[PDB]
Amino acid sequence: PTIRKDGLKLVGSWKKDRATGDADEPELRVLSTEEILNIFKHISVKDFTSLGFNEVFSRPEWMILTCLPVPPPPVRPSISFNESQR
């Protein structure tokens, strides 16, 4: 397809071949993140190096979030005016 970006969404359009007999209308669909993750998980090591990523530290599958780390309270300290005023 041909991919465009609308806000936070990634929308693809399929331009069907003119020999198929259908009109040159690119069917539009919002690509699902899990499908893109599945596609990225299937890439190989030689393509890892060729694209410009790394096998150990910088795989592309990791660019899509599944679990979100929570920083300790030192990073987000609470200011307490009084005993019950936080």
């Binding site: 979030l65 679990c67 979100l68 780390p69 929570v70 920083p71 300790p72 030192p74 990073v75």
Partner: peptide, 11 residues
């Protein structure tokens, strides 16, 4: 002396 430790949230 406590640096702080990390939690996690599942999506």
């Amino acid at each position: 002396e406590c640096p702080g430790h990390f939690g996690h949230i599942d999506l």
